[PDB]
Design a protein around this ligand. Structure first.
Ligand SMILES: NC(N)=NC(=O)c1nc(Cl)c(N2CCCCCC2)nc1N
Length: 246
């Protein structure tokens, strides 16, 4: 997250932190995700496509810091890793960039909701907030494009939804943005998602309900003028989500 504010997991208690264990034994951060039911975290396929073995992954819930434990956190193995079969990637765009992780603890339990661990509601089909609506994004991604390190502390910021018309202009992304994607950005381009925020939640208030409107997917650089963040449009994937979680 470029700009924004530090936060703790109580403010985004559906946020999932996904790590990978290497053959060398070291564990590194991969991507964010969101808890949508006790046994299911939703994320982005591009996060796992290179290393699609479920066994290598670890998922934390209720975690506010990257490399230290947070009181109350839960740790899970990945029982199922479900990538979207129509995934594809260009040199920038990721299409159908959506994945599901079924989580299971070493005792064989799913998540237990708490003050730091809660599910996020899915949107109604094809039901998105109007352009110009303010939504929240959350992650452990870079604070500056030129940073080597990720922040130790969780961050969040606010971005406004951009119309498909505006995002499809040639100076923005042209055809790279599709109707299965949403764009969002700051009017001054001063705050944004970045590398390491992929898979994390774009949350909007819809009806009167915090709702998972998007999943961080891609962008050309971060917080660059005329280059919004691009998000998988969750309201266009409900049958896929339901089919793979039921
Ligand atoms: N919102 C904006 N502007 N960007 C992003 O969200 C974003 N930006 C980048 Cl550079 C990124 N990378 C960079 C390497 C290629 C893809 C994987 C990780 N992932 C993102 N999700």
């Amino acid at each position: 997250i470029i700009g924004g504010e530090f936060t703790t997991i109580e403010n985004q208690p559906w946020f999932a932190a996904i790590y990978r264990r290497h053959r060398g034994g070291s564990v590194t951060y991969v991507c964010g995700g969101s808890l949508i039911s006790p046994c299911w975290v939703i994320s982005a396929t591009h996060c796992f496509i290179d290393y699609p073995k479920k066994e290598d992954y670890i998922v934390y819930l209720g975690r506010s810091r990257l490399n230290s434990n947070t009181q109350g956190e839960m740790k899970f193995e990945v029982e199922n890793l479900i990538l979207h079969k129509d995934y594809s990637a260009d040199t920038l765009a990721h299409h159908n960039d959506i994945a599901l992780l079924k989580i299971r603890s070493k005792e064989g339990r799913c998540a237990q909701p708490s003050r730091t661990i809660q599910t996020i509601a899915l949107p109604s089909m094809y039901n998105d907030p109007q352009f110009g609506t303010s939504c929240e994004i959350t992650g452990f991604g870079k604070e500056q494009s030129t940073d080597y390190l990720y922040p130790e502390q969780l961050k969040m910021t606010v971005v406004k939804l951009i119309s498909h018309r505006e995002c499809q202009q040639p100076h923005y992304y042209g055809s790279e943005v599709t109707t299965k994607m949403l764009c969002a950005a700051d009017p001054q381009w001063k705050t944004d998602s970045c590398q390491g925020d992929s898979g994390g939640p774009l949350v909007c208030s819809l009806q009167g309900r915090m709702t998972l409107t998007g999943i961080v997917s891609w962008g050309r650089g971060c917080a660059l003028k005329d280059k919004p963040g691009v998000y998988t449009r969750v309201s266009h994937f409900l049958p896929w989500i339901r089919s793979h979680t039921k």
